[PDB]
Design a protein around this nucleic acid. Structure first.
Ligand SMILES: Cc1c(N2CC[C@@H]([C@H](C)N)C2)c(F)cc2c(=O)n(N)c(=O)n(C3CC3)c12
Ligand SMILES: Cc1c(N2CC[C@@H]([C@H](C)N)C2)c(F)cc2c(=O)n(N)c(=O)n(C3CC3)c12
Ligand SMILES: [Mg+2]
Ligand SMILES: [Mg+2]
Ligand SMILES: [Mg+2]
Ligand SMILES: [Mg+2]
Lengths: 708, 690
DNA sequence: GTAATAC
DNA sequence: AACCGTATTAC
DNA sequence: TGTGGAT
DNA sequence: GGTTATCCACA
């Protein structure tokens, strides 16, 4: 696990804790082996301020750090016996690296304080940028850390340099690594020093401790959701965890309150759609989709991307699947989906509707990490995806659980709230009565559903749909045909058979999964004279045949986390749809005005065709022809360009009644569009009309039944 | 590992051997659990005709078959006490599936013969097309299409309907028709001896509800299918451009995507998925590992891919995964693709039938020798070491001018291999031998030097090591020598290699026979090795053992083909244009009546027809005329056009001559070869001796 | 025992 | 992101 | 425990 | 291609 330096020298030797085996590799190659050791950290590092000292001892990483520094841990820690003068934390300069620096520091604090107090623990800063320039053989390069340092490089170099924005240590060669972050004579470091032992204890415990409330409050109060230098432990931990917190809150774990997507989902959709990988066209190798995503939009592991893509495709997790996938995309038994090298995929037809009108400038775009392509920050959302498909849900200081809903019900609620902005929950619940899990079952708790629909939190009960079949020999048989959302069929069955094997309740002959490609069925065969209600009851209480589902509805509203209920959600959707439909209408109106202008021009041209040809023949060149067109006949620039760039064959379709029809069509179109832009009510009707069109086209029956 | 049926019944119960854990998944999901069990075979199954009965017994996949079937193995096999009525092998309808069946069958012919003789072994044929078709013949009737690349693209519902359901499935039943003609077929195709296999392949492989098939037949079609493919479309290089198909697809795909030496690097994963989705229907690991090799300058003499990040090291440590790295084509790679846009090379459809791909690249330098190739197919394998680009080109140029040249003269320009890792190559006569027959055994030995140290001690210092040798294992193997005192005098071993140099120090003890030691290490560690030429390439769709002459000849032939093709293409462009310009020049002389005629016309179609009829314009001219933008009518400069007419004519003459005169053509070829040499030449690294 | 495309 | 097994040839 | 984007 | 550990919140 450890790559030891060549010669033991407690006075010079350095220990590099590197983020990941891959960068560990590069660093093994780039090091100076006389005095630098490498010790890769394979994945996120254990929070030694949250976990049991037991699990902490059993930890592969912690154990090998205690034993290569060779000074023991805890109160039995002797600085004098250490094997390194410098410990150096070298992570990507990304938010997850920020997180790792945090975790490692809270270990060196808790269990090796003397090393931190003696200023022996540093943090290496990899560069953020590399500027051009050249071409292949004759190509030069320089590095920068501050957007300011970058501005100064642009002064030199000049044109035509090109910036490479480093996304993490993985895109550096060993030669580049050494020169910029490992060479003692070249590198910028940070020395963690403790300035105030007191102020540093509270800082570490708030952020890294087991208690959630404090941390939530620390984040609410500090995070603004809108050579060698010293940093304090308090100040560093503050700044690094602040970055991670903000990031996984607004850009990883929680869905946007308008389209109900996490950023990775939005990118999966946007990418596949750009590439015309749509419901009406041939499937397409998953790996091809995943790589395009990873290359154009989402700078994270393929497995995160693929796994997300997969989930949006499983109809027992999504109420209305957004991706269709050919092949083994898993099962309710929780077995593993085929690797992205085996499967093909495309957008579902309904996904199309989440994306409807995206070409029409209806939604804010941001630059991507390459600064090479724009991507959308929210989708146009032609149905209220947050409630229909749900979300879940773990961040920092916040987590989220929102159950799926029946498309027709959600839309009915919305259409009501559109006519009646001030509607109370009691009334919306006549349209939207409760969750509809794609897996069906029975949902119990009208009261707790209101609580949740009102506060974002609530606890409801989900219970399996059962039936009793009689068998020959006078013996009964419990048959289960629907089970509760998010429950693994295979385990459930094992856990029930466990009840039989342990004879927890009397009367169980045999458990058998009898589910086949078209239908779920767990048969529980009872004995001769078993109290059949006694069994069913015990199984509800002591296995997941029946569970508690907990609403924790948190979404991102105006850039910040928000515990929210049916009303903040529905109105947020409505508000959003409003911005879009207006944007859309502005777009189409401008496009129609421009055309109308040309068409007006062509209509005049036709009546003076001969004069115009003569006049163009008479000009010297393109520009000259346009000026003569303007001056002699008062056409505008935009018309003149249009006229002068018609191809010759056009002087045959010299037909003005058909152009006049287009003119009329356009005036009428423009009138319709203007009315939408100019009157809230006309526009909300357009919204209601479209929402109804989607319900007609996609509605399906409830699956889950309701009881209180 | 096994998914067993619900009820035990040796009358109905079926055992499904599914290629892949992944399809094993679909299988488990799609079956009828009351009587169908699932055993996924996870990867290529062991050859039970080559391996020892030692390793055959320790085998994971073999064991669990001998234990799930529960009848015992080999001679202690009682069919009576079995567990299934039908053992059903179910793989991709691809070449590797074919191979897999082949390996299973040889297991069931060798260690459970009774089972195959009583016809309990079957072969599930999955559909080729989507309604579903199996024959390219049935597809004609169904067409009054998704072409399936494997079981993996199939939903569990579809699996059941097409190939698992006893009512809808099309099976093949394995039968032994001639117990002896069958022993020979299996022994020949799957046994230890290669020569009988090679011969079998040369004589048979033409490189151009329930039916019963013989074991001699099934193994014939199956192994021939895999053989041919593995020989043509995997392991061996095209003699012309030196690429194996995965490599050619890696380059063509990245090139198509503008991922070139002069442009910023793309994420390795994006490139790889593009290759996988567009051209190469195999696993990403293969594709990426290939991409990575082409980027390592201690394996290629002239790297075709530039990769940012951890792409491995001479110490043999794993390259970062494709999610970490980025890449682009190297400048020289550009030259392999030069002129591809010009119809200079044969294209074929891809599997998807969406895109055409090239079957050989233009190859402006002779890649096969420069970079070399290795090398393991069926009945054949290949090793061809890298050479120095200036030297290869010098040879080719001499040969262009002297087609019937002898190896001896050619070796004045191409003295022998030039390994990217340098070192010392010993053996001129074996080099000659290899250049003559494509087989040869030379010696490759490390660049050494002796540093004197304080205290009357000497130090042996390594600076280059043999091609294909792992630095780290070497350094370890030398140290073992020290630690076990096999030979005497080693004080310490130190790898002192840094980011910009290779250096291994062997410190010796006071008064230790430094030659004795150095000889010992040469013989007993890879400090010195024997490299073996076995130059096999693909010429005319078939494997050919070849030396320096057919290689150079084939390259020259190829270049001739490309240059001619290229020259036809440019000439046709120049002519299509000359023709139009003649048309315009005319039009200007009679501008007024043409505008009139178009004016009179009743639409584009009628206008073109009127131009042709009234003024003898051709279609192509008419088209051009009639799609001019109005502002064109402003110009009446016939002189600028006439200058273009002249330039096109000079151009056409020069091109025609290349097509019409062999000497002209070959001069061009030489001119271009020399430019490439001038641009990319670098000095020898490996020294020569005999 | 390796090498490098495949599973 | 490493680890694990196997086919194929040849020395 | 287990959930799903992350390393 | 499965397995193996972690973060983070909340029952
Ligand atoms: C399964 C399998 C292995 N193993 C490890 C154990 C062995 C068992 C004995 N079949 C299979 C193995 F050790 C390596 C791979 C592999 O590298 N790549 N790229 C793969 O795609 N697979 C899958 C076969 C396709 C691998
Ligand atoms: C390393 C590591 C693991 N392990 C198992 C042991 C453990 C110890 C803590 N290093 C690391 C592990 F068990 C699973 C993964 C993983 O699924 N995916 N997708 C990954 O990319 N990695 C790498 C971390 C990024 C994994
Ligand atoms: Mg990173
Ligand atoms: Mg329960
Ligand atoms: Mg296959
Ligand atoms: Mg040797």
């Amino acid at each position: 696990k450890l790559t030891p330096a060549q010669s033991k020298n407690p006075a010079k030797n350095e220990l590099y804790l590197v983020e990941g085996d891959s960068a560990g590799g590069s660093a093994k190659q780039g090091r100076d082996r006389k005095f630098q050791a490498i010790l890769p950290l394979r994945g996120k590092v254990i929070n030694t301020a949250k976990a049991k000292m037991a699990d902490i001892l059993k930890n592969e990483e912690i154990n090998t750090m205690i034993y290569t520094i060779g000074a023991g841990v805890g109160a039995d820690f002797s600085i004098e016996d250490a094997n390194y003068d410098k410990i150096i934390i070298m992570t990507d300069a990304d938010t997850d690296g920020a997180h790792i620096q945090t975790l490692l520091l809270t270990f060196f604090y808790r269990y090796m304080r003397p090393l931190v107090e003696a200023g022996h623990v540093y943090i290496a800063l990899p560069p953020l940028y590399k500027m051009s320039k050249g071409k292949g053989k004759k190509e030069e390069v320089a590095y920068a850390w501050t957007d300011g340092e970058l501005e100064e490089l642009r002064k030199q170099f000049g044109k035509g340099a090109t910036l490479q924005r480093y996304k993490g240590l993985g895109e550096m060669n060993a030669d580049q690594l050494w020169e910029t972050t490992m060479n003692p004579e070249t590198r910028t470091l940070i020395r963690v020093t403790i300035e105030d032992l007191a102020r540093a204890e509270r800082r570490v415990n708030v952020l890294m401790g087991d208690k959630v409330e404090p941390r939530r409050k620390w984040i609410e109060d500090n995070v603004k959701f809108t050579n060698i230098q010293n940093m304090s432990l308090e100040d560093i931990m503050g700044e690094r965890f602040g970055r991670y917190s903000k990031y996984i809150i607004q850009d990883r774990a929680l869905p946007d309150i308008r389209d109900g997507l996490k950023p990775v989902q939005r990118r999966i959709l946007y990418s596949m759609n750009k590439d015309s990988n749509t419901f009406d066209k041939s499937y397409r190798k998953s790996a091809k989709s995943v790589g395009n995503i990873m290359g154009n939009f989402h700078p994270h592991g393929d497995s995160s991307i693929y796994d997300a893509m997969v989930r949006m495709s499983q109809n027992w997790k999504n109420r209305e699947i957004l991706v269709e996938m050919h092949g083994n995309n898993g099962s309710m038994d929780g077995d593993p989906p085929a690797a992205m090298r085996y499967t093909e995929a495309r957008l579902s037809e309904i996904a199309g509707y989440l994306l409807q009108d995206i070409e029409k400038k209806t939604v804010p775009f941001a630059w991507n990490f390459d600064d090479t392509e724009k991507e959308p920050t929210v989708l146009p959302a032609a149905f209220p995806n947050l409630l229909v498909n749900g979300s879940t849900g773990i961040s920092a200081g916040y987590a989220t659980d929102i159950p799926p809903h029946n498309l027709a019900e959600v839309i009915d609620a919305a259409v009501y709230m559109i006519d009646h902005p001030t509607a109370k929950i009691d009334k919306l619940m006549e349209f939207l009565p409760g969750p509809d899990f794609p897996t069906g079952a029975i949902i119990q708790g009208r009261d707790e559903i209101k609580k949740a629909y009102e506060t974002g939190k609530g606890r409801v009960v989900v219970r399996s749909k059962t039936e009793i079949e009689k068998l020959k020999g006078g013996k009964e048989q419990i048959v289960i045909t629907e089970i509760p959302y998010e429950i693994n069929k295979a385990n459930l069955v094992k856990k029930i058979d466990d009840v039989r094997v342990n004879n927890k309740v009397a009367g169980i002959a045999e458990v058998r999964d009898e589910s086949d490609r078209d239908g779920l069925r767990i048969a529980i065969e009872l004995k001769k004279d078993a109290n059949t209600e006694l069994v069913l009851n015990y199984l509800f209480k002591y296995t997941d045949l029946q569970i508690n589902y907990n609403f924790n509805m948190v979404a991102i509203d105006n850039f910040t986390p928000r515990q929210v209920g049916i009303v903040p959600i529905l109105s947020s959707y409505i508000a959003h749809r409003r911005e879009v439909i207006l944007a859309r209408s502005r777009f189409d109106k401008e496009k129609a005005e421009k055309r109308l202008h040309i068409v007006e021009g062509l209509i005049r041209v036709i009546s003076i065709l001969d004069e115009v040809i003569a006049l163009i023949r008479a000009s010297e060149n393109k520009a000259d022809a346009k000026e003569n067109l303007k001056v002699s006949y008062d056409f505008t620039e935009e018309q003149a360009e249009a006229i002068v760039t018609l191809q010759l064959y056009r002087l045959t379709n010299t037909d003005v009644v058909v152009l006049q029809e287009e003119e009329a069509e356009l005036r009428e179109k423009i009138a319709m569009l203007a009315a939408i832009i100019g009157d809230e009510r006309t526009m909300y009707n357009l919204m209601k009309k479209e929402l109804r069109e989607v319900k007609k086209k996609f509605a399906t029956p409830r699956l889950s039944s309701l009881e209180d």
